[PDB]
Amino acid sequence: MDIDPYKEFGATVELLSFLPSDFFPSVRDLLDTASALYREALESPEHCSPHHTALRQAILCWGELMTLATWVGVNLEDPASRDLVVSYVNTNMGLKLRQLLWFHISCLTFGRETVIEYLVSFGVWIRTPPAYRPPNAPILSTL
Amino acid sequence: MDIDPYKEFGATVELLSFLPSDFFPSVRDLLDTASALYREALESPEHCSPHHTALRQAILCWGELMTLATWVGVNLEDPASRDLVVSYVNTNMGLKLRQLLWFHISCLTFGRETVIEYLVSFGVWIRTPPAYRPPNAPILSTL
Amino acid sequence: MDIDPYKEFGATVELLSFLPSDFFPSVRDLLDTASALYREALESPEHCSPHHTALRQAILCWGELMTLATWVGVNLEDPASRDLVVSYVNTNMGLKLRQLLWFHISCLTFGRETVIEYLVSFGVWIRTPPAYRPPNAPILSTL
Amino acid sequence: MDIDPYKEFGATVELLSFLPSDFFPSVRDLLDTASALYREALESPEHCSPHHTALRQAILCWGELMTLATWVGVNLEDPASRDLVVSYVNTNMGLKLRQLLWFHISCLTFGRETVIEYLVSFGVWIRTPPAYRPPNAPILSTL
Ligand SMILES: COCCOCCOCCOc1ccc(C(C)(C)CC(C)(C)C)cc1
Ligand SMILES: COCCOCCOCCOc1ccc(C(C)(C)CC(C)(C)C)cc1
Ligand SMILES: COCCOCCOCCOc1ccc(C(C)(C)CC(C)(C)C)cc1
Ligand SMILES: COCCOCCOCCOc1ccc(C(C)(C)CC(C)(C)C)cc1
3-state per-residue secondary structure call for chain B: CCCCCCCCCCCCCCCHHHCCCCCCCCHHHHHHHHHHHCHHHHCCCCCCCHHHHHHHHHHHHHHHHHHHHHHHHHHCCCHHHHHHHHHHHHHHHHHHHHHHHHHHHHHHHCCHHHHHHHHHHHHHHHHCCHHHCCCCCCCCCCC
Q: How far is the C-alpha of B112 from the C-alpha of B104, rounded, in Å? A: 10
Q: How far is the C-alpha of D15 from the C-alpha of B123, rounded, in Å? A: 62
The reply to whether C68 touches chain D by the CB within 8 Å rule is yes
What stretch of H or E contains D63? Answer: helix D50-75
Q: How far is the C-alpha of D132 from the C-alpha of D125, rounded, in Å? A: 9
Nearest CA in chain A to C22: A129
Kindly report the backbone phi and psi dihedral angles of residue B78, in degrees, each rounded to the nearest multiple of 5, phi listed first. -110, 95
Ligand 4, residue C57: give the atom nearest the CA. Answer: 17
* Cα(A72) to centroid(ligand 1), Å: 18
Interface contact A5-B56, CB threshold 8 A: yes
Q: Give the 3-state secondary structure of residue D39.
A: helix
Are C101 and A127 spatial neighbours (Cβ–Cβ below 8 Å)?
no
What stretch of H or E contains C23? Answer: none
Nearest to A63 by CA among A22, A35, A24: A35
Q: How far is the C-alpha of D67 from the C-alpha of D84, rounded, in Å? A: 16
Interface contact B68-A88, CB threshold 8 A: yes
What stretch of H or E contains C98? Answer: helix C94-110
Q: How far is the C-alpha of A36 from the C-alpha of B104, rounded, in Å? A: 29
* Cα(D94) to centroid(ligand 3), Å: 8
CA distances from B44 to A1, B38, B39, B41, C38 (A): 11, 10, 8, 5, 20
What stretch of H or E contains A71? Answer: helix A50-75
Q: Note the helical H segments in A76-111.
A: 79-88, 94-110
Kindly report the backbone phi and psi dihedral angles of residue D117, in degrees, each rounded to the nearest multiple of 5, phi listed first. -60, -40
Are C5 and D60 spatial neighbours (Cβ–Cβ below 8 Å)?
yes
A133: nearest CB among C32, C37, C139: C139
Q: How far is the C-alpha of C106 from the C-alpha of C95, rounded, in Å? A: 16
Q: Report the first-to-last Cα separation within chain D, whole angstroms.
A: 41
Q: With a 6 A CB cut-off, is B5 part of the ligand 1 pocket? A: yes
Nearest to C69 by CA among C53, C43, C47, C87: C87
Ligand 4, residue D58: give the atom nearest the CA. Answer: 18
Q: How far is the C-alpha of D50 from the C-alpha of D56, rounded, in Å? A: 10
Nearest to C67 by CA among A91, D18, D89: D89
Give the experimental resolution in Å.
2.9
Which one-letter amino acid corresponds to residue D47? H
Length of chain A: 143
* Cα(B88) to centroid(ligand 2), Å: 21
C36: nearest CB among A14, A131, A132: A14
Ligand 4 pocket mutation, candidates C27, C100, C105, C119, criterion most atoms within 8 A of CB: C100
Length of chain D: 143
Q: Which residues contact B92 (CB under 8 A, 6 or more apart)?
A: none
- Total domain count for chain C? 1
**Torsion from C-alpha of D86, D90, D93, D98, nearest 10 degrees:** 170
Ligand 4 pocket mutation, candidates D3, D42, D57, D60, criterion most atoms within 8 A of CB: D60
Q: How far is the C-alpha of C30 from the C-alpha of C99, rounded, in Å? A: 10
This structure was determined by cryo-EM
Ligand 1 pocket mutation, candidates B96, B100, B101, criterion most atoms within 8 A of CB: B96
Strands, E assignment, chain B: none
Kindly report the backbone phi and psi dihedral angles of residue D32, in degrees, each rounded to the nearest multiple of 5, phi listed first. -60, -45
Q: How far is the C-alpha of D61 from the C-alpha of D82, rounded, in Å? A: 20
Which one-letter amino acid corresponds to residue D19? L
Length of chain B: 143
- The alpha carbon of A50 is separated from its chain's Cα centroid by a whole number of angstroms, namely 15
What stretch of H or E contains C28? Answer: helix C27-37
CA neighbours closer than 13 Å in the CB half-sphere of residue D47: 12
Give contacts of A15 with chain C, Cβ < 8 Å.
36
Which one-letter amino acid corresponds to residue D69? A
Q: How far is the C-alpha of C128 from the C-alpha of B80, rounded, in Å? A: 73
Distance, in angstroms, between A83 CA and closest chain B CA?
Answer: 11
Which 8-state DSSP code applies to residue B19?
S
Q: How far is the C-alpha of C119 from the C-alpha of C12, rounded, in Å? A: 10
Q: Give the 3-state secondary structure of residue C10.
A: coil
Q: How far is the C-alpha of D4 from the C-alpha of C45, rounded, in Å? A: 9
Q: How far is the C-alpha of C66 from the C-alpha of C63, rounded, in Å? A: 5
Which one-letter amino acid corresponds to residue D78? D
Nearest to D42 by CA among D105, D93, D115: D105
A18: nearest CB among C22, C32, C143: C32
* Cα(A96) to centroid(ligand 2), Å: 3
C75: nearest CB among D1, D50, D84: D84
Distance, in angstroms, between C54 CA and closest chain D CA?
Answer: 6
The reply to whether B22 touches chain A by the CB within 8 Å rule is no
For chains A and C, CB pairs below 8 A equal: 42
Q: Give the 3-state secondary structure of residue A47.
A: coil
D24: phi > 0 → left, psi -120 to 50 → alpha, else beta; which?
Answer: beta
How many Cβ atoms are within 10 Å of B65's Cβ, its own excluded? 21
Q: Which residues contact C63 (CB under 8 A, 6 or more apart)?
A: none
- The alpha carbon of B120 is separated from its chain's Cα centroid by a whole number of angstroms, namely 18
**Torsion from C-alpha of B121, B125, B127, B131, nearest 10 degrees:** 160
Q: Which residues contact A64 (CB under 8 A, 6 or more apart)?
A: B93, B96
Ligand 1, residue B62: give the atom nearest the CA. Answer: 22
Give contacts of A57 with chain B, Cβ < 8 Å.
5, 54, 57-58, 61
Domain range holding C119?
1-143
For ligand 3, atom 24, which residue shows the shortest CA distance? C60
Are B9 and B107 spatial neighbours (Cβ–Cβ below 8 Å)?
yes
Distance, in angstroms, between A52 CA and closest chain C CA?
Answer: 26
Q: Give the 3-state secondary structure of residue A111.
A: coil
The reply to whether A5 touches chain B by the CB within 8 Å rule is yes
3-state helix, strand, coil in chain A (%, to 5): 70, 0, 30
